[PDB]
């Protein structure tokens, strides 16, 4: 009865995601296209309250619905898959790739040892594997996932449904670029759940794979803090260690959300923040405007 218990638990986990997606799916209508309207309409009264990003994500969900319906035509084939990674072809159109959780463990660790250990031992091992998968998957797909209608979740988090093997997920789809690692580590490769099947217990995610673009007429200057002596004491200038200059305009930057490489600063959005005029005047050259702080630690650059 392990599979039935697991199905019940997984349905309990998956139903809220399906309902959240249905809130936008049910209230998004594709009117007959013409020259007067070039897109689909969102039912604002039915949505009620939504941020701009959530509405744009609903639009993206609609645009996904076409290929989602194409994929769901192969629902019987999806259920029949018994391999970890499988490729589905029917008319050489939009070849569907299917990743199955724990299928490699079933094929390489339980079926080969079914002769060697008792049926109760194998059943307990299977139940343990499913429960560990639920314990690890809950951090990402549990109640922590409040807004499933969003393309802001990184593919590394999305891949927890596939044991966190996002490398297999990305290479299966065929993505390849010089900035693969730079896009990955900067949280720029994201995914969005576009379909949940409660009967077959599978989901369809849409991977958003962007390209890095150099921001023209912009650089990011770094300052190396060094303790300086004044009045028989050691001091450190309390100044932005990273300054963003774009079109010769000085602004602060939230580096913490960016990937710093030796050549450039890679960010998944514009993380520029304003700078007070006194800090800008000190960086401009009015050193009496930059504050300092006493150095009491034995170890400081």
């Amino acid at each position: 009865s392990v599979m039935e218990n697991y199905k019940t638990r997984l349905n309990g986990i998956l139903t809220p995601i399906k309902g959240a997606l249905e809130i936008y799916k049910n209230n998004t209508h594709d009117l007959v296209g013409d020259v007067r309207l070039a897109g689909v309409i969102m039912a604002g009264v039915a949505i009620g309250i939504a941020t701009a990003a959530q509405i744009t994500a609903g639009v993206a969900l609609y645009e996904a619905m076409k290929n989602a319906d194409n994929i769901n035509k192969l629902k019987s084939s999806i259920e029949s898959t018994n391999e970890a990674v499988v490729k589905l072809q029917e008319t050489a159109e939009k070849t569907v790739y299917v990743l199955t959780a724990l299928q490699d463990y079933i094929n390489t660790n339980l079926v080969p040892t079914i002769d060697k250990i008792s049926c109760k031992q194998t059943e307990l091992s299977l139940d343990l594997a499913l429960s560990k998968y639920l314990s690890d998957l809950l951090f990402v797909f549990g109640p922590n996932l409040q807004d499933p209608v969003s393309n802001s979740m990184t593919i590394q988090a999305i891949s927890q449904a596939f044991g966190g093997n996002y490398e297999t997920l990305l290479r299966t789809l065929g993505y390849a670029t010089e900035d693969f690692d730079d896009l990955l580590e900067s949280d720029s490769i994201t995914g969005q759940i576009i379909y949940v099947d409660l009967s077959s217990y599978y989901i369809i995610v849409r991977v958003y794979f962007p390209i890095l673009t150099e921001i023209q007429q912009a650089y990011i200057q770094e300052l190396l803090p060094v303790s300086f002596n004044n009045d028989n004491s050691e001091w450190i200038s309390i100044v932005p260690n990273f300054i963003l200059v774009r079109n010769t305009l000085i602004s602060n930057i939230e580096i913490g959300f960016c990937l710093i490489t030796k050549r450039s600063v890679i960010c998944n959005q514009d993380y520029a923040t304003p700078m007070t005029n006194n800090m800008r005047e000190c960086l401009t050259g009015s050193t009496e405007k930059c504050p300092r702080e006493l150095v009491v630690s034995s170890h400081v650059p």
Partner: antibody
Framework: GLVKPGGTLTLTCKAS????????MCWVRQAPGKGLELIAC????????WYASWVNGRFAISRSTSRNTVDLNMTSLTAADTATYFC?????????????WGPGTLVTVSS | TGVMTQTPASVEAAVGGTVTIKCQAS??????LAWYQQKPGQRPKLLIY???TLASGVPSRFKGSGSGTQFTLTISDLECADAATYYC?????????????FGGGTEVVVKG
Amino acid sequence: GLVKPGGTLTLTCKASGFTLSSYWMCWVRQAPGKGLELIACLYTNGATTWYASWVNGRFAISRSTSRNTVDLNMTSLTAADTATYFCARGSGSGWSWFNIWGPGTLVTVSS
Amino acid sequence: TGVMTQTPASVEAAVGGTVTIKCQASQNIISSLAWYQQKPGQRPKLLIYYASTLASGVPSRFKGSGSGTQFTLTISDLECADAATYYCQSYYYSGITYGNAFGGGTEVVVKG
């Protein structure tokens, strides 16, 4: 074996070579001179049940869980229900082939 | 639903020959097929499980084969005691897809 058209009957498993709760258990029926037909299985947890498409709630499985028995309940019986009803254990806890077949109980509907 | 098309209904073959029974599943069952032997007035006897694996104590002349939709059962070096009705059954259980059915049956009779 005696029963009246429209009556009810309750059968019991006669395997008795193991603990009944730990194994996959179907009820197989076979009309005289006809092929084997699967009626209904019962998971080891005891709540989830499998039913063929044709029963439609006419048959029901339960276990005594204390005397180590498994029962089958029948209602609205007809001449087609005349058969030998086999209690078949299925080799494992989950879905599987049967390696133990019960002796079976003859059932005859007739005025 | 799930159904099993088993051919042929009956068949004749002389002692020492080979007979081939075939079972067709409406849906893919992924090698989850069994084969049973039943003699009149007796309980069935398990012959083959998982389409290929022979049950313990079953002679090797019974050979099963197949995967997915099509499966075969071949009995070589036929004996008199082999005459019986032969059934197949699907016990498919992926976890989300349920496929369980019995074959119609094949009556084999050996020419002595």
